[PDB]
Ligand binder design. Structure first.
Ligand SMILES: *[C@@H]1O[C@H](CO)[C@@H](O[C@@H]2O[C@H](CO)[C@@H](O[C@@H]3O[C@H](CO)[C@@H](O)[C@H](O)[C@@H]3O)[C@H](O)[C@H]2NC(C)=O)[C@H](O)[C@H]1NC(C)=O
Ligand SMILES: *[C@@H]1O[C@H](CO)[C@@H](O[C@@H]2O[C@H](CO)[C@@H](O[C@@H]3O[C@H](CO)[C@@H](O)[C@H](O)[C@@H]3O)[C@H](O)[C@H]2NC(C)=O)[C@H](O)[C@H]1NC(C)=O
Ligand SMILES: *[C@@H]1O[C@H](CO)[C@@H](O[C@@H]2O[C@H](CO)[C@@H](O[C@@H]3O[C@H](CO)[C@@H](O)[C@H](O)[C@@H]3O)[C@H](O)[C@H]2NC(C)=O)[C@H](O)[C@H]1NC(C)=O
Ligand SMILES: *[C@@H]1O[C@H](CO)[C@@H](O[C@@H]2O[C@H](CO)[C@@H](O[C@@H]3O[C@H](CO)[C@@H](O)[C@H](O)[C@@H]3O)[C@H](O)[C@H]2NC(C)=O)[C@H](O)[C@H]1NC(C)=O
Ligand SMILES: *[C@@H]1O[C@H](CO)[C@@H](O[C@@H]2O[C@H](CO)[C@@H](O[C@@H]3O[C@H](CO)[C@@H](O)[C@H](O)[C@@H]3O)[C@H](O)[C@H]2NC(C)=O)[C@H](O)[C@H]1NC(C)=O
Lengths: 346, 346, 346, 346, 346
């Protein structure tokens, strides 16, 4: 008979004494607000700024005994967001917001429905730019753990407690992909209960493990680093005497190893510790220059050393030549097997 | 006699029991809202961010039996956007908004008119920055399909259903051009009906097929890649003996093929898979270096090998020379015919 | 006696039946709104985005017979923008807004005055980022025509018509200069009457012809392109025999012509058609490389060809030398006279 | 007894006939509003956009005889910004705003106090991004004059006149420094009275003279330009015969003079006229290349010219050598003394 | 019995004469507002703009005798931010805001509670982009002191005084790290009492000492500067005669020392004074070029100077050779010990 919006105006109005400024179960046990999120979008994970943009559906559920109706014949009463400032809502916020906003296009993207016993479902759409610190000690082979944490601002622990629901506390959209990362499915859920000089305030947090796409940096960097070192060694398969081709093929490995070192730290923050993209690349710099010294070991013999005199001349340089030819794959592949299985277990 | 705005205030006011918080056909069949868009602007299609900005006219049509007037002698009653928060409107939103806004310059750019039988036309101007994932496996020769999807936020499927109208569900402005793409005319129109733990919500979506302008990358990249490979082969039409001109014309092809590899991946995301602009260009790198080995095959003879001794010296190198001269167009044009007709059928 | 604001409250209030939701001359002839703009600022003309920012004073004039007073002894009644939502105003908008805003610093920058016969002057300050497509077939020598168009949003042609006034429909500020362009004084004024499936809507538009400053690109690009070609020819005034100076002065023209080709397409969109800054510059690339082939024509004689044998050696190369010396200004100045007078008539 | 806010509500309310929509001295002499600013922050002076951000305290003073109280025992009544829309205020705006905003953090940063005779002090905090054209004919040695101008928007000259007060019309904060400029203390104060087709409107303006920091560009550019020219001359102190060291030290001056010409016009607008950073640098380009021709004048003798024949060979080249050695400081220091004292008097 | 929000409406309403426009202790002693902040986020410390973004909790405490309740049985009455414009609050602002905003997601992030004796606690969440001047005379080894200062805007010193509380006037979040800096724990707290021509206004300020991470610039710059100088000296361990290897290893040190000088001043402002990253690097430029002159001192002997003639030829050059070999670590390590212990005490 009577429509729900007319029914609900006398359920929360000045009649029946409902005050939206007062929490449920006032002067009693605290309010148990259970939460779960639905990640629509994810990404633009900046590393200069060390933050990431997410677009979620924040669903909040609690019980309000003041809103419990008994005689109206429906099981749920929805409430459009025009009258949304008229009941009590929890003062949730994010402890690492770094700017956020609602979505208000064609309607405020907000949802509210009330069960018969007073169970309240509240769902809004938020875009967050959440801050997470980035550990980059092993940069292309790292697992970034960026978190988000949900706190009360005004109510202390003895008035309002946040929880995650057991039925899927973080849902992720179906085809949610990232251009540079993989979002793992194990999502840690734990408390971050804050203590200030004002009081103690509730917190729950979710932890997202992000693992990179190694395939990009392997193409741009690790393959043009690997081939120049092989270019460095075919350069020694030049003739035995000091040819000017060793001058050009020497700087050929120099002009590439500096160019690959030019755009190497392109989009990276200025961290003090050393990462892993350069301890690969600094080794690729000294294996360039070890071929530049290898021409000097030709010129070490060529200006130092007639049937007797010329025989020691070639015999000493070949004694360096076949040793230097074998030892360059020796010093490389021992390093190259020490490099990857280090990061395979880290 | 009586003006429409005075007539409409008693048609939707507190008299006659109209409540804007309640959908039409309440406790009955769901509301059938039919939609079509008019794309004014399009583009700024970012690929680092994988989104695109669009500027549309969102037209929504439904029937409200509460608004059906009978005695007023006009066929349509317009309603200025000052009184627009006074009737019911659908809570449409975009599932991939990534930020959006209205246009409010000199007047809120909004339109509302009401037919005699209660048919309501509602038209607004929106600017969207819609997210679309970018498949870039064959980057200059790809067909990007970027979509837009229109959902209800608060009403489930048993209360509100979106549809596309048959009479031109997507209109495009007349001279709408893109700097980098071609918008095809076949626009797929289908449903994306969402299931959450809240309920099931209606969705309709439109699919835009975008095909690139290959003419830009052919000028900056494919022509300076093609000529250096031809520069690499006239470099072998140098004299037969080991001249220093082969040192300079060797690095001449090196200084260009790295410079063309420098600004190659300029404005591109860091995708893990390999695209097609570099498997053209990596082949253009090894055909540079195959001429650098071709001087080494001159120096392979020059320091290894008197009427008998000099005759085998020139005869072996010419046996390599005329083979290497013919085989370089052989290995190129077989690749070059394998490259394009692969992407002609993809 | 009675102040104007007290007089005007009974002229447009609930007394005397004035309704701001209803256009003048309702159920009669359409409203003739005449417009003119005053461009304060102009520029930041982007070409990657193909838009430009303008800052105007939009003056609108129409007649409202409901506002015609007769007994008050003043000729014009101004109205401060606090009461500006109380009379009727046209719903003008720009069909290519791409974002715009008002100016509200220290007061809403808005102006309204009402004549005795009901003539209404309405003037506001708007900042627009107007979209214009950029034709760049001849890029440093182009004339860009970027437009702006003013439409009604809610009223059709039978209710509201926009016009330009004859008395200076576009005024420009006094010292309005642009860093890269010249705004011509001939400004085309014409109609762009839109037909949608909703109805037909009025439009008037203004066309601004923008002509570039050729002096910038002549300094950075055309002078360092011209001198290297002259550097390419003094390089042939080296000694007759194959000297190593031709190796260095060969790549001297190469290291500049690629560097000038590096920052050439610096701030340009990725258009598919070829512009004019590169068909100058591609010709400046092959006149670099024609001197690199000119050393090969020295080495074509030096390894192919004793009083008889040496006389044909110098006689053939000088036969190429004096021909190549004259023909390089021949092939250049014919092109250079064909280049500019092409664009002098376009 | 009675508090000021209760006293002031009957001083400006509906009682006593005060109307905030009506200027003081209505139908009388115009309102004399005197102004002065306090510059808190200054800078981020962009040159691509040709604007600058400033953060001021705009103090406005006028007399309102309607607000003159006589019996309340205090000399000044302050007014908090909640009731600030209740009295008359001038409609000041900036004719070159290019976007501006108020500051509203923890309170609207606004100030109002009223003297006994009706003198009103009004002070607000504004952040402006003011447009100024940039003359850059002598770019590191220029004096930029960027202005700001304060106008009425709705009141003509016969109703409202702006003035600067004699007691320090522009105050500057104490430690206000700029990273690239020096703000001179002579600040010109004059009128810019505007004439439109609407009427004539008041304007006062202030002129700020900005002089650059020459010390930055002297370090990055003028010292690495000076030393390469000295590197160009010690390069001639090589041995007399045509050595290959002149090839390397020739391009040594080329690889630097183009690199210093690469990042020279880094953050500069595309002005058509020639500035002064390049007419220094273009001269530094041809003094590089004059040493490249100086090796050609060695090779002019080396392939043109036995006790008689060799004596003219060395005697002609030394006749060029000692002349070219002295003349290079001759042509440089005459230019270098002509360069700076030109800009010392401009 | 009676709820607090109903109790508080009669405590601050129109009954009991409370006026939020009037400060506590009016016409009496000034208001003593004590402050402390809690820094949540810190950083994005720009140096081109010379500012930094901070995210704080601003806690303000004062006493209001008008709000002192006696009969209600609770010790603290909280107040939700809906009724927050209903009591008096101090008009705090930041004298170097450069733009700031509140946080309003899911609730206005604001907190208010009132003790029994009228002590008021007020806590809000602010994001500031605070301006600080950057002294960069010794750039990688500097200690930046960036401040923040809290002032009243409308109340003078005889009405409102700010103080820092003794109990931890600046708290910092637990794991607050910076990518480039270290926030020291000694935080200076002092007054910055402002004198304008309006009056004198209260100020308190906090000073944050920021010390850089030297480890980043030591890896990218100081190690590739150190090794090239050692590369410059092994280059002299080439053979004694003038070899072409000294040409290539000469420019090898040139191509790196300019490349390291290319991206050196990458993200730096254009300060006029000289910093310390280049007086390290300019010395690393002339120790590159001192090896280029060292080949000229070989060619000084090679073209100037038969059993007697050749003995003085080698004896003079070895007299330069062993002196130049020892003196290069002599001139370097004296500088290198003078460089660091200068900045160790500064
Ligand atoms: C919100 O959730 C919390 C946590 O589940 C609830 O707190 C817990 O409530 C139970 C039942 O009210 C308490 O058990 C009782 O404890 C007292 C004292 O030990 C004992 O005398 C009773 O026999 C009974 O065992 C429990 O102590 C309490 N725990 C805490 C930490 O507060 C809370 O009641 C929930 N509130 C609502 C409104 O649902
Ligand atoms: C909005 O559009 C939907 C889809 O066209 C309408 O739903 C359909 O409405 C028709 C007629 O009301 C239903 O047909 C009837 O079905 C019942 C049960 O099968 C049968 O007893 C009747 O004889 C008749 O055939 C149809 O089932 C129904 N389909 C669905 C999926 O709901 C809806 O009525 C429209 N609402 C409005 C307000 O226009
Ligand atoms: C706004 O401007 C338009 C265009 O000037 C006006 O429309 C024109 O108005 C005139 C006079 O009212 C019309 O002339 C009349 O035409 C009828 C039918 O042909 C004829 O019987 C009369 O003897 C007279 O010639 C003219 O047709 C009409 N044109 C159009 C295209 O509408 C309009 O009246 C102006 N409205 C106002 C409020 O000023
Ligand atoms: C605001 O400031 C302006 C400029 O100081 C004032 O205008 C000037 O006011 C004086 C005195 O009212 C005028 O002098 C009188 O001029 C008339 C006509 O010439 C003469 O008959 C009188 O004997 C006396 O000399 C003066 O002309 C006038 N000048 C202008 C350009 O308007 C104005 O009165 C000030 N208004 C207020 C409210 O303070
Ligand atoms: C806010 O804090 C300030 C600073 O602590 C207080 O000002 C100081 O208040 C004391 C006590 O009211 C004053 O001491 C008195 O001074 C007078 C004159 O010298 C003397 O006759 C009395 O015997 C007594 O010693 C003190 O002068 C005053 N100082 C200043 C600089 O104002 C203020 O009272 C505090 N206000 C509130 C509301 O708490």
């Amino acid at each position: 008979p009577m429509p729900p919006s007319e029914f609900l105006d006398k359920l929360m109005g000045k009649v029946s004494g409902y005050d939206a400024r007062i929490r449920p179960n006032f002067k009693g046990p605290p309010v148990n607000v259970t939460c779960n999120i639905f990640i629509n979008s994810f990404g633009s994970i900046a590393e200069t700024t060390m933050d990431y943009r997410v677009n979620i559906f924040l669903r909040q559920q609690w019980n309000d005994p003041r809103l419990a109706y008994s005689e109206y014949p429906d099981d749920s009463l929805d409430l459009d967001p025009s009258m949304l400032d008229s009941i009590w809502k929890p003062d949730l916020f994010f402890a690492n917001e770094k700017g956020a906003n609602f979505h208000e296009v064609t309607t405020d993207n907000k949802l509210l429905r009330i069960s018969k016993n007073g169970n309240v479902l509240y769902s809004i759409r938020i875009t967050l730019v959440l801050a997470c610190p980035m550990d980059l000690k092993n940069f292309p082979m790292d697992v970034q753990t960026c978190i988000m944490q949900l706190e009360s601002f005004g109510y202390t622990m003895n008035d309002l407690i946040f929880e995650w629901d057991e039925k899927g506390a973080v849902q992720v959209a179906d085809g949610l992909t990232l251009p540079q990362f993989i979002l793992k499915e194990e999502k840690d859920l734990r408390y971050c209960t804050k203590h200030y000089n004002t009081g103690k305030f509730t917190c729950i947090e979710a932890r997202f493990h992000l693992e990179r796409q190694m395939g990009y940096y392997l193409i741009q960097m690790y393959i043009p680093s690997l081939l120049i070192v092989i270019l460095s060694w075919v350069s020694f398969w030049i003739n035995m005497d000091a040819a000017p081709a060793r001058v050009g093929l020497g700087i050929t490995t120099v002009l590439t190893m500096t160019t690959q070192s030019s755009g190497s730290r392109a989009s990276l923050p200025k961290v003090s510790y050393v990462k892993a993209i350069d301890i690969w690349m600094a080794v690729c710099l000294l294996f360039v220059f070890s071929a530049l010294l290898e021409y000097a070991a030709v010129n070490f013999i060529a200006r130092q050393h007639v049937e007797e005199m010329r025989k020691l001349f070639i015999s000493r340089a070949k004694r360096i030549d076949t040793v230097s030819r074998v030892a360059f794959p020796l010093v490389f592949l021992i390093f190259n097997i020490f490099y990857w299985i280090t990061y395979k277990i880290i």
